[PDB]
Design a protein around this ligand. Structure first.
Ligand SMILES: Nc1ncnc2c1ncn2[C@@H]1O[C@H](CSCC[C@H](N)C(=O)O)[C@@H](O)[C@H]1O
Ligand SMILES: Nc1ncnc2c1ncn2[C@@H]1O[C@H](CSCC[C@H](N)C(=O)O)[C@@H](O)[C@H]1O
Ligand SMILES: [Mg+2]
Ligand SMILES: [Mg+2]
Lengths: 242, 242
């Protein structure tokens, strides 16, 4: 209702980690991430750390992993669902070749405007077509229009978590055979390991349930092969088989 | 040489995990790994779990991730350093195309022969050239024989951990530009996060120190891009830049 509105301080999970200790995560970041992080990614991360929804920001070690996957697979055309201030988007744009093209979809362009100056300074704004919309209608329109020559090599899904299974039904048609779909947050702070988890905000509980269902669906889906990876808050890589 | 025992039972870290939640690791395996694990990988894993060096067996979630990398990068020729009973090796042979080729190097052929019946039943023994040797002399001979056109697409390094930096100096010349070198165990049970860590066997302490040194070296090495990934016992993916 009216009042102060939603704050990440209403959530129960924000200080949880999947790694053994905060010391281990800090070691990875300080040793293997920050020395390899573009100046503009550092600037975008530091501003975003102060933002009211900072809990949503993709982890920086996960960012370098996404970059590595895009390069090893020679991705050129990609889609991102859930942009926020742009950390995964800028990571992706820096990883792609000069002629790479990203379709980036988010319901709230004001978040993207926080990252836009960093993206511009990095020299990669030309690779990004940002669309301000709920993602499902955009994907459904794409399914009417896109031809084989326009299929995506890679999709990163990091938007509203309860809709991931709906996004999957479109993305297995929009990403080429042999292409990759990466779903972020599939371990949901560790809560997915429990059939009940006390004290969660109703939105957090909804995502525990939706991720438990999604993880079973993806493990059973013959259209993809999968790898669930315990980096960040968990992610699942899907490769389209047919 | 004379000294103290260094069998698995002499080590302190066997049961320590990089994830804090044993329930979360089991959830990943039961939900996203075992339903996707080839029958012959299951059989090879089950025998290896009973073997006296079971702690060295690659994690099964990590196996599916290595398979995913190999397929997404369209690897065809690969090298494996440290085979043990063959779990990563069989994972790799299943992932590669029918005409794929693996050079697999281990000092102990008897360990390989434990896994070999499972590899044979999977129909992929023909992709594997197993070399019974210490790896460093094999790599040095390869430097003298290899042509640019036969460089490997992918190397998995999982042998004697203190020698990884020595292996790296050869592998950056034996993997193609754009190819991948994956170093296993680069988080060493999480002990790398600490400048001092009491209660280790001397060989475990040697690896903590050698991984702390390697992780700094790789983060500073301009010949590669890197991503350290907190899956299994940690691994670092390197992509050769020039
Ligand atoms: N239905 C929907 N369609 C598209 N975007 C949505 C959406 N519901 C929520 N979002 C957006 O999903 C984003 C989730 S956070 C994305 C994090 C970002 N990828 C990073 O690298 O840090 C938010 O910006 C939010 O506005
Ligand atoms: N100098 C050396 N050269 C090659 N192999 C070595 C070596 N020193 C030890 N090894 C081998 O390194 C292996 C480490 S365990 C390898 C695990 C395996 N990749 C898996 O997927 O489970 C052992 O089999 C050991 O015999
Ligand atoms: Mg996320
Ligand atoms: Mg290992």
């Amino acid at each position: 209702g009216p009042g102060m509105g939603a704050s990440q301080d209403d959530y129960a999970l924000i200080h949880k980690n999947i790694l053994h200790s905060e010391d281990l995560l800090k070691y990875i970041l300080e040793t293997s991430v920050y020395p390899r992080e573009h100046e503009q990614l550092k600037g975008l991360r530091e501003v975003t750390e102060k933002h009211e929804w900072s809990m949503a920001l993709v982890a920086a070690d996960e960012g370098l992993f996404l970059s590595m996957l895009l390069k090893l697979m020679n991705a050129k055309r990609t889609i991102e669902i859930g942009v926020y201030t742009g950390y995964s988007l800028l990571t992706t744009a820096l990883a792609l070749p000069e002629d790479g093209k990203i379709t980036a979809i988010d319901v709230n362009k004001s978040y993207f405007e926080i990252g836009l100056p960093f993206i511009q300074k990095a020299g990669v704004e030309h690779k990004i077509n940002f669309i301000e919309s709920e993602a499902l209608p955009v994907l459904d329109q794409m399914l009417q229009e896109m031809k084989e020559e326009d299929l995506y090599d890679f999709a990163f899904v990091d938007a509203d978590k309860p809709n991931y299974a709906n996004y999957h039904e479109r993305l297995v048609k929009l990403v080429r055979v042999g292409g990759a779909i990466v779903y972020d947050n599939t371990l949901w702070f560790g809560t997915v390991a429990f059939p009940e988890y006390p004290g969660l905000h109703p939105e957090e509980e909804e995502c525990r349930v939706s991720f438990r269902n999604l993880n079973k669906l993806l493990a059973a889906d013959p259209r993809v092969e999968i790898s669930q990876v315990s980096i960040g808050d968990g992610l699942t890589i899907c490769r389209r088989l047919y």
